[model samples]
Target chain A: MKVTDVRLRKIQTDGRMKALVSITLDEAFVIHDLRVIEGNSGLFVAMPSKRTPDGEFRDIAHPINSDMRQEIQDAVMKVYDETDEVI
Target chain B: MKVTDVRLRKIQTDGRMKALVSITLDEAFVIHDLRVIEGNSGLFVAMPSKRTPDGEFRDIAHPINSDMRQEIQDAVMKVYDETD
Candidate 1:
């Protein structure tokens, strides 16, 4: 599937937490709540997740391999670079 | 994408553990380490995950919504039933 669209929701309050993302795939499927984080090394994407009963966070959606992983990261960063609005 | 193959790695020793699933999508991409869990409510699918530095489990791959979720589950369970 191809990544059709990506929207960056920048956060002003947190430094490491750069933005939240909404990724659309194949022009049909959409996954909201992806995270764009500026970490110690650089930028990376985190999938949507849920909190377990024990308070652990588990990803709800992610790439199974590096092929899709790179595909997703490239798409998200492209959108983030284009977006000038930060909140 | 269509689920082309599903291999069941059943845990005969642990009843609640059910099985580990490996699904091939469109005959091209494969995702292993999916779990077939027998929970209190019933059966459910768990995606691959990793433990964070702080000790939280995070999924490595998952469905985006109920449609894809149901699609994956149906395909997986259908294979599970057929092979049984």
Candidate 2:
């Protein structure tokens, strides 16, 4: 299905280091606690998850195929472990 | 040093031929009576000027090198004259 609409909910302002953008998608899915970080390159929206032994942030939200799901999830996990000072 | 601000003055619409966009650059510079046209490729902002005998629209505004001024003006003039 296609996302009919998206509305911004809350924005966490921590000196612009990161912006926690909570939005409601399609008015059905209750997706909260989404993180918007200002990386060295640019801004990015990511889901919440713990880190793995390999070191990386575990990402949950992605717009891709089913096979890529596990790969992306593992990547997120890797990132979670790599993060030093958690924001 | 940098663009302090940009204020839009007026917009003249003619069906779809073009949309005249009048904008003021910085604070001291007041460049109004501009035209925003939707070409075959994309949209463009142009200055106001009448057509010349050589078939072209005379342009007055541009964000480029000084040497390109005459070239752009000529091009506008050529466009205006060719419209017939």
Candidate 3:
């Protein structure tokens, strides 16, 4: 299981909200609705979820280390550089 | 080349807002920071990206048809349900 590719999906303006990111995994699996948030210490990524009644999104289950976490961050950031053009 | 699994990661209080979704593809590739928003007509998902200096995100690349589009949407929504 690996992330072959990922795309940042753009959502039209919803008032002052930002667009949603579209992500693809292994070119076969796909997950949508990803966004970044400003954390107190640094920056972290988040995924969408309707699991909870209030809508609870989950964070990346990093490899329990900075190395793996940075890897995930790098991959995401790379794609981020790909979809900078807003329509 | 397949999505083996997916799990949602929870974020602590940043004062304002929703948590980011953590996704795993085929157990190999991983993308974090996924979210949903209220659309004028409906709801749409977004992925985290820093492609532009101003920071612009992209949309899903559907198969150019409803069937494929729905399929992709289903896969994503399935995770959404699972994460739920």
Candidate 4:
């Protein structure tokens, strides 16, 4: 599947979480609450998660394999870089 | 609660997932399967998760508030940075 739309919903400066993203897959499937975070090595995308009854958080939606995971990240970053790129 | 110990178990330089971490809180509670992923703007921590029947991944442990989340991230990164 392809990412139809990518929305950089929120940006943060003070926290490890730099932004929140919402993506539409194949122009029909929508996944919200994805995150863009600034970590030790670099920036990465985090899937949306829900707090469990035991007080833990789990991913609500995620790619099953590494290939799909990379595809999603690349698509989101491609869009993100286009807007933030500077000369 | 305070994070007492941090263990960065695996490092992945090829994929979006950079590392896998297991942390101990207050020397009593331990959380595993935490991930360090590389993103567009930077890097960040992803909580442990389990696949559901509907094929979705759910977090096993996460901070209730942003502050607590920041704290956990900070602690995890502090240890991660030292090794890398």
Per-model TM-score (chain A alone): 0.86, 0.43, 0.51, 0.83
List DockQ, one per candidate, in order: 0.14, 0.01, 0.11, 0.02
Write the residue-wise lDDT of candidate 1 on A6-84 in tens digits.
Answer: 8778877667778877777655345666888888898888777656779987555556667677878999988887777
The backbone clash count of each candidate, in order, is 3, 24, 49, 21
Regions more than 4 Å wrong, model 1: A85-87, B4-73
Q: List where candidate 2 sits over 4 angstroms from the true fold.
A: A1-87, B1-14, B52-55, B66-84
- Across all models, the iRMS values in order are 6.1, 24.1, 7.7, 14.8
User: All candidates' TM-scores?
Assistant: 0.59, 0.28, 0.37, 0.47
Top-down DockQ ranking: 1, 3, 4, 2
Model 1 residue B26 distance off true place after TM-score fit, in angstroms:
4.9
The interface RMSD for candidate 1 is 6.1
lDDT-wise, the better of 3 and 4 is: 4
Sort order, lDDT high to low:
1, 4, 3, 2
Q: Mind giving the per-residue lDDT tens digits that candidate 1 earns over B1-84?
A: 566677886677557777788776544445666788887898887776656437886655556677777887888787777765
Q: lDDT per residue, candidate 3, B1-84, as tens digits? A: 433454554335442333355455445545555554344565445454323425664432223345544553456666655653
Q: Residue by residue across A1-87, what tens digits does model 2's lDDT show?
A: 223232232334454335333332223222233455566775555553334458774443333444333433343334433455445
**Residue B27, model 2, lDDT:** 27
| Per-candidate chain B TM | 0.85, 0.45, 0.51, 0.87
Worst 10 residues of 4 chain B by lDDT: B24-33
Identify the candidate with maximal DockQ: 1
Model 2 chain A: lowest-lDDT 10 consecutive positions: A1-10
Candidate 4 interface RMSD value: 14.8
lDDT of 4 at A20: 71
lDDT of 4: 0.70
